[PDB]
Design a protein around this ligand. Sequence first.
Ligand SMILES: [Mg+2]
Ligand SMILES: [Mg+2]
Ligand SMILES: [Mg+2]
Ligand SMILES: [Mg+2]
Lengths: 291, 56, 208
Amino acid sequence: TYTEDFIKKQIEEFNIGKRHLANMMGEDPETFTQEDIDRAIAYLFPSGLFEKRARPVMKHPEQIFPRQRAIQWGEDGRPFHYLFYTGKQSYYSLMHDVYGMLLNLEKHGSRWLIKEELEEMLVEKLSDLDYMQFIRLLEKLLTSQCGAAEEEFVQRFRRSVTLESKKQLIEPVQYDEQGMAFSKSEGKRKTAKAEAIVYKHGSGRIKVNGIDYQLYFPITQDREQLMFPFHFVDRLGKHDVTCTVSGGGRSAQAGAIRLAMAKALCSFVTEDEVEWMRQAGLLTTDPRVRE
Amino acid sequence: HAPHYIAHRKGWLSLHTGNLDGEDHAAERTVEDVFLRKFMWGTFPGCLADQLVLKR
Amino acid sequence: SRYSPEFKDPLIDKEYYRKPVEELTEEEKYVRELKKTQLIKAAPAGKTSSVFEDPVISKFTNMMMIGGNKVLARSLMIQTLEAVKRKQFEKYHAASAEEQATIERNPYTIFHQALKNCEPMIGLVPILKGGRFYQVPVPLPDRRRRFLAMKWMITECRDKKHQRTLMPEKLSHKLLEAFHNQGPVIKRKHDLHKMAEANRALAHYRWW
RNA sequence: GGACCUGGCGGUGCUUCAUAUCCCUCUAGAGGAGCCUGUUCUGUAAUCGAUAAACCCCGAUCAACCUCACCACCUCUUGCUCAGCCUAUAUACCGCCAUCUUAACCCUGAUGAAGGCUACAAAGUACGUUAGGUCAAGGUGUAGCCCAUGAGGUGGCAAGAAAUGGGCUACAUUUUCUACCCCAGAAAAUUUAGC
Ligand SMILES: [Mg+2]
Ligand SMILES: [Mg+2]
Ligand SMILES: [Mg+2]
Ligand SMILES: [Mg+2]
């Protein structure tokens, strides 16, 4: 256990050590901050331990010792809160407030708070049924014509985590010295890595490492893989490709080029066609690799 | 702490360049460490609170 | 598996995406809107949006590979198709006028009909009790009989009685025999259908 | 003798489903030939027993006239050096591996045995162990024989038959050789995984 005098003494010890560290590092003690403390301790006591907690640390005493011991009554013994004897003064105070707002209104991509976070904010353990009751009251408040104050009050309990949209970031359009528009993109399959440049206008010429694709890829399967992206969006014979692939083997190189070409081509199609390519598997990096 | 924490929570009691890639004489440094530890544990009997740290 | 459970298999069908939004029913529209939130696996090497793609021939080729040699298996498949085509052209040229109407020259049609003529409808599934693995007739699923036709054709062509006759030549001959409901694979289907008729004692066990 | 309470059946079946491990079903390869090992039977006076200890050096190998081990005969010995011997013991310890074992408070029932839940809420809240293995990448002791458990010599010993358990080689036409690295020319039953 940690007494209050004990933590008091740790507070003066931390402040004096902070002033000393400011002296050691040459920084001005007045403006010497906690990020500066962390940086200086990292320099002076280098530690490559993977656990960040195991590394040397110089925190404020309040950050080290939990001391979640709140005083709820004074010297005369009178509790501060009028709901003290319920044992859940914060939770029931909040329910009382919500009910008051509901009465007042009756006279007139985001998520509900989880139970343990609600506990953290209320600093009191609460059951599942009472959590459900509170959430039901909040829903009832939302259903009514909540004003700005009530909307903000509910937003205090609303978290923004829900929903995430997979939109396939498009590459920008670059322009070469001749004035032609092109887009560059990268792809990887097994140990093969490819970078493709797809021009907006062309006659369907694909050059792999400066070599024609049918000469670079004798096997028909690789040529079909290279055909797949352009055929899927019905623009065969409308673009020129200049790619560079290294590593891997025949099939890995063909797949990496397919991926790079699809990602580069996404610049010159409509967003609907981009999403269709994504749903066809043409824009996902294949993570399957050897053990 | 168990041996699988040697670079996660614990450190190395001995610190020398022998085991780095390209360096030599790791065996000689190891034998030196062995003798130092036995000698020191025999010369300070019941005094040592913990393990030695051997820096080089 | 390197893919997380949330990843979904891709849909390579190309005409699927070209349906007008007007035709889309509410359920299909909901499915399409749902597909936007999911992660989709990378399309595997193999199937493509090509108009010449044939999943049955792809599966037959995969069932012919040995030790991951896909180039050789595909070479054998194309050689077999070309051999069937040339044989049919030879038979068509030498035929009189009224027999040229009933000679098929599309090798894909012949391949599909040959495999269809070899599919078994019913088979036997062993069931364990008493130390006696009880052989009950069972109606084979569609996938099962499709697999069995291909497996019987391949095993028939891999027989060692056929000495130094190359695989495309054996396979085209067997395919053209099965096209006309002849050969050893059709007899293998028949000798399963009769040998399951010979064991209709346990013909109503419906919980295999 | 009367009343009541906890039991005990690690019990027995039957009903429905969650029913994941485990099952099957299903998919792909694995029996022949020639050598080498495991067990049995038969047979010898005896071991087809081993090479920090032979030979072969293309690989590997059998018995080699190496040498040790065994059987039948013999010889030494105060000798090598107060000699000599992997002879035993971890069933001596230590090292290393492995086996197993390792609450309080508050209420209710008349302050009986005893009991305590309802959410639009009604008392509930807080190390040892082992006739264990290892004397090959390691040690500290203890005992044995010391006319023989030491050192030599002369002959032999070199097995036979199966049924099954296991291992190694070559085993092809979807093959082989050359050129290329893929459009060429010539030759000819259980079991193992599944994901
Ligand atoms: Mg001896
Ligand atoms: Mg010995
Ligand atoms: Mg022992
Ligand atoms: Mg012998």
